[PDB]
């Protein structure tokens, strides 16, 4: 009757084979249990079942791990639905769309589905940026070695701008500091946080910040740096 | 009654399935134990339970490792809360926000949460810079081969500056030494320690140090080196 229920939406070949499989599986168990109720070589039957179930376990490890981790997700909620996810250790990055017992159905940002097994979440670090608070801005202003005299005041101006920018969160960090030399340039870091979590508003603020930086730089007399070389002709 | 407690904040589908699961799990155990109290094929039941629990263990390895490592963290305190962490072997880098029995909730420096399993801390080296004492400064002053005659005195001047800089810790190391040639440049190392652990003050001192280095170099007549080439035209 199970086979007939399987027959509506599947094939005869596979349903027949699956019938054979489940039939063998169900007869073998009761033969193993009542083979000594018949009284026929108990410990041989014991060995038979032992090695069979032993290989079966070594195989189905892969699947039961998925199932048990599905349970842990059912109770432990590292993420939920709609929560943008990623992992540094693997490509998972997408919005969750569905949880399952074996797997999860994520939608990437390609609008593609991704069917992930749940064993992975018990071995791997998971990042849920959808829960986050603020969004980061990071740059390196690459000036020239000619413009070294102008660095302190550029830096102070940039800082004073960010500190008086509406979109920016001043309770969080706010760092503008000449942090390294570099081949062909002097690199000023910028490290700031916007009080939005929205993609577009973050990007718009990033935009305004960058354009104001440009205006500041080119005002003070400096200019950005391309790569550079010294050619000793012959 | 457990199911009904689960029903308040979850669904009927999953709670029903979980009911089935726990029901099977609880009946099977007592059937296994009292199946011979009925007296029905003891050693067949023994095999059944053996292989079942064997696969179960091979699977739940992944989870029990997390739990036991959570216990070790409960007793052994490599880190605590508020302690910036990293590992060279993996991306974990963030401030701890919460410990758990299975996992930890870190906040990255993106203000993003990261849910890490605790099995990882028993396999991996962990660095707790939040406990540290002093912060390092490292650079390579890339001069030119033309400026080789000026290296000893530049070096000595730089050393004398750092040694008379307030923010610097002289009990720790302090190294300024011409350490390598390089394609296109002569590279002087700098390796020093600030007596702060704060990000911003460290960066400000880094700043002042670098600007003074620049002034020193350009005073003594040298200048920094871009990459370089010799072009043999034809
Ligand atoms: C480790 C050794 C074991 C190795 C693995 C051998 C295979 C084990 C048997 C297959 C696992 C169970 C598959 C899940 C479906 C259950 C079987 C089935 O026929 O249901 C089909 C059923 C569809 O329902 P209907 O078409 O309406 O049929 C109604 C039947 N009541 O399939 C489904 O997937 C239902 C939706 C669930 C999707 C989630 C992924 C599947 C897991 C479901 C629950 C957990 C079952 C597996 C773990 C059992 C642990 C005791
Ligand atoms: C290796 C084979 C085992 C494979 C794994 C099969 C699944 C095992 C069962 C699930 C593990 C236990 C989950 C932890 C919650 C306990 C079950 C539960 O219903 O509590 C929910 C409970 C929430 O509480 P209430 O909603 O108020 O309900 C009150 C119930 N007293 O869930 C919680 O997460 C509590 C907060 C703890 C968070 C820390 C992570 C979970 C671990 C908790 C403690 C350790 C339990 C697991 C190890 C047991 C070792 C004997």
From Swiss-Prot, chains A, B:
Q: What are this entry's molecular-function GO terms?
A: identical protein binding; mechanosensitive monoatomic ion channel activity
Membrane topology term reads: Multi-pass membrane protein
Question: At the top level of its lineage, which domain of life is listed?
Answer: Bacteria
What are the record's GO terms for cellular component? plasma membrane
Q: Which UniProt keywords apply?
A: Cell inner membrane, Cell membrane, Ion channel, Ion transport, Membrane, Transmembrane, Transmembrane helix, Transport
Q: Does the keyword Transport apply?
A: yes
Any transmembrane segments, and where?
26-46, 48-68
- Signal sequence range: none
Cite a single GO BP annotation.
cellular response to osmotic stress
Q: Which residues lie on this side of the membrane: Periplasmic?
A: 47
Cytoplasmic face residues = 1-25, 69-234
Provide the protein's localization.
Cell inner membrane
Q: Main site of residence?
A: membrane
Q: What's the subunit arrangement here?
A: Homoheptamer.
Protein task: Mechanosensitive channel that protects cells against hypoosmotic stress when highly overexpressed.
Family statement = Belongs to the MscS (TC 1.A.23) family.
UniProt name for this protein = Low conductance mechanosensitive channel YnaI
* Organism name: Escherichia coli (strain K12)
Of the parent protein, the shown chain spans 101 to 334 of 343
């Amino acid at each position: 009757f199970e086979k007939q229920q399987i027959k509506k939406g599947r094939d005869i070949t596979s349903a027949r084979i699956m019938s054979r499989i489940i039939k063998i599986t169900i007869i073998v168990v009761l033969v193993l249990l009542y083979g000594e109720h018949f009284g026929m070589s108990l410990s041989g039957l014991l060995t038979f079942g032992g090695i069979g179930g032993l290989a079966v376990g070594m195989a189905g490890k892969d699947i039961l791990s998925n199932f048990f981790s599905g349970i842990m997700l059912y109770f432990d909620r590292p993420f939920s639905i709609g929560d943008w996810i990623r992992s540094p250790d693997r490509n998972i990055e997408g919005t969750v769309a569905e949880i399952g017992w074996r797997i999860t159905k994520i939608t990437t940002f390609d609008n593609r589905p991704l069917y992930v097994p749940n064993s992975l979440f018990s071995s791997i670090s998971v990042e849920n940026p959808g829960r986050m608070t603020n969004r980061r801005i990071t740059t390196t202003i690459g000036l020239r070695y000619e413009d070294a005299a102008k660095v302190g005041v550029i830096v102070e101006a940039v800082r004073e701008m960010l500190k008086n920018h509406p979109a920016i969160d001043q309770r969080q960090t706010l760092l503008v500091y000449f942090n390294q030399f570099a081949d062909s340039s002097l690199n000023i870091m910028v490290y700031c946080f916007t009080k939005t979590t929205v993609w577009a508003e973050w990007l718009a603020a990033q935009q305004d910040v960058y354009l104001k930086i440009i205006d500041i730089v080119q005002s003070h007399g400096a200019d950005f740096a391309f790569p550079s070389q010294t050619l000793y002709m012959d």
